[PDB]
């Protein structure tokens, strides 16, 4: 029996088959409906047809906010992306840390009642990333579309009282790159233009080890400047914007936020945990998610955490090349284990107990 794994991101859904090393389908978590006056489109097709559709993003900060739209995404995922009949497959779904109780139940109700899944399971994204790195203890800094989570985990279980979040992630960095590129005189405002800004962010941005020193270097020469060719053929020049953009992760004040940067958030989560486990958290800081993909980010996290921690504390940042997909891969391994069959919620169990069984089977 072949299990499916679906990682429900706020910006991008990752879906595929347990036992594969990568998701088969990666597509925007978007539902489009006729703009004025097929009833709906999902994913790439919705995005491409945006000229005639109004687009909705049913997941915000990793939390589902519109269940009708989420159900459309899942229907599309099964029937169009994976080309499966969901009544034939156990399904592992992921959830944000601290996903509300009612939401976990609703996910469960939809899978069994709408899709007739024979079995399902819900796993916390950060925990799957930790497992994917081959660890049972560590702190995961999971940064994707709209939120960055810091999730301490001990001997396989998240410590809910110590989970924190910074309300800044990739979409905010894209918006910020858009804003700072206006200083140079480049106006990017449309959807296709925002996609160009996202590409500039993904291809040319980096995290400065020493931000002040980098700004000095940028101001004193053209050493750090880079050329970028627009789709029309025009060539633009990017300078300190390359590292100012992801600097916002460490200095949220760049976005007018009062919140502590990601390094401090990580430290604060560690300090909320039992003193006896903190060594193991500092020694196992795992970066996960698309927004952790900036070159230089692991070196910078190491520098910043080293400054916050006692000098004799060993800091280790683990930043796997595959970390955009760590959550999905962790799910693929978990759902493949010979012991998995004993862990899922079965249809029979759901029929007897209802949605609340999720709190007893998945934690």
């Amino acid at each position: 029996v072949q299990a499916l794994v679906i990682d429900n991101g706020s910006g991008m859904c990752k879906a595929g088959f347990a036992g594969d090393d990568a998701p088969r389908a990666v597509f925007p978590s978007i539902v489009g409906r006729p703009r004025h006056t097929k009833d709906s489109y999902v994913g790439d097709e919705a995005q491409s047809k945006r000229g005639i559709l109004t687009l909705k993003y049913p997941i915000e900060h990793g939390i589902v906010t519109n269940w009708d739209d989420m159900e459309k995404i899942w229907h599309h995922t099964f029937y169009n992306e994976l080309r499966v009949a969901p009544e034939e497959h156990p399904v592992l779904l992921t959830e944000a840390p601290l996903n509300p109780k009612a939401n976990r139940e609703k996910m469960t109700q939809i899978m069994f009642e709408t899709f007739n899944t024979p079995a399902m399971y819900v796993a916390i994204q950060a925990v799957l990333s930790l497992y994917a790195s081959g660890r049972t203890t560590g702190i995961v800094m999971d940064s994707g579309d709209g939120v960055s989570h810091t999730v301490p985990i001990y001997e396989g279980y998240a410590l809910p009282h110590a989970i924190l979040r910074l309300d800044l992630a990739g979409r905010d960095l894209t918006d910020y790159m858009m804003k700072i590129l206006t200083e140079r005189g480049y106006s990017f405002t449309t959807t296709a233009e925002r996609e160009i800004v996202r590409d500039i962010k993904e291809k040319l941005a980096y995290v400065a080890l020493d931000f002040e020193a980098e700004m000095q270097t940028a101001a004193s020469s053209s050493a750090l400047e880079k050329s970028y060719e627009l789709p029309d053929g025009q060539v633009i020049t990017i300078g300190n914007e390359r590292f100012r953009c992801p600097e916002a992760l460490f200095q949220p004040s760049f976005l007018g936020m009062e919140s502590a940067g990601i390094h401090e958030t990580t430290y604060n989560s560690i300090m909320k945990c039992d003193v006896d486990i903190r060594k193991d958290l500092y020694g196992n800081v795992v970066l996960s998610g698309g927004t952790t993909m900036f070159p230089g980010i692991a070196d910078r996290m190491n520098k910043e955490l080293t400054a916050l921690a006692p000098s004799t504390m060993k800091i280790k940042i683990i930043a796997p090349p595959e970390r955009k997909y760590s959550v999905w891969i962790g799910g693929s391994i978990l759902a493949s284990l010979s012991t998995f069959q004993q862990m899922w919620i079965s249809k029979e169990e759901y029929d007897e107990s209802g949605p609340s069984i999720v709190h007893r089977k998945c934690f």
Binding site: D21, G134, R135, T137, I333, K361
Partner: protein, 128 residues
């Protein structure tokens, strides 16, 4: 839980008496290592080691070590970590978990192998 109980045959065997038990991750399963091969680790593989010690009142002390070869694949190291959590849960959370990386193993782990553990190249193919 609910309608299911732990049924994996190797879990049923785990930690019943004082001693050392070693399993190798093989294509998403936990497979016992022949006892005459204990201490000979494939650097391309991941393993789960349970050391059971008898305490004074007769209860059992557990240390679970998951050993990760320099060349083991992501499915193997991930599975070794998850099986470790699962075995600890099965053992009522009584086990201390230890991540053991080839060449950086704890003194405790190394001490399990009276004549010294050995490394050998190769191993079972990835389940990916």
């Amino acid at each position: 839980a609910g309608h299911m109980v732990v049924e994996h045959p190797e879990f049923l065997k785990a930690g019943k008496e004082p001693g050392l038990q070693i399993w190798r991750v093989e294509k998403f399963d936990l497979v016992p290592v022949p006892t005459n091969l204990y201490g000979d680790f494939f650097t391309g593989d991941a393993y789960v080691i349970l050391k059971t010690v008898q305490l004074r009142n007769g209860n059992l002390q557990y240390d679970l070590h998951y050993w990760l070869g320099n060349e083991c694949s992501q499915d193997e190291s991930g599975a070794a970590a998850i099986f470790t959590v699962q075995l600890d849960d099965y053992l009522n959370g009584r086990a201390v978990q230890h991540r053991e990386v080839q060449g950086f193993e704890s003194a405790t782990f190394l001490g399990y192998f009276k004549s010294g553990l050995k490394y050998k190249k190769g191993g079972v193919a990835s389940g990916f």
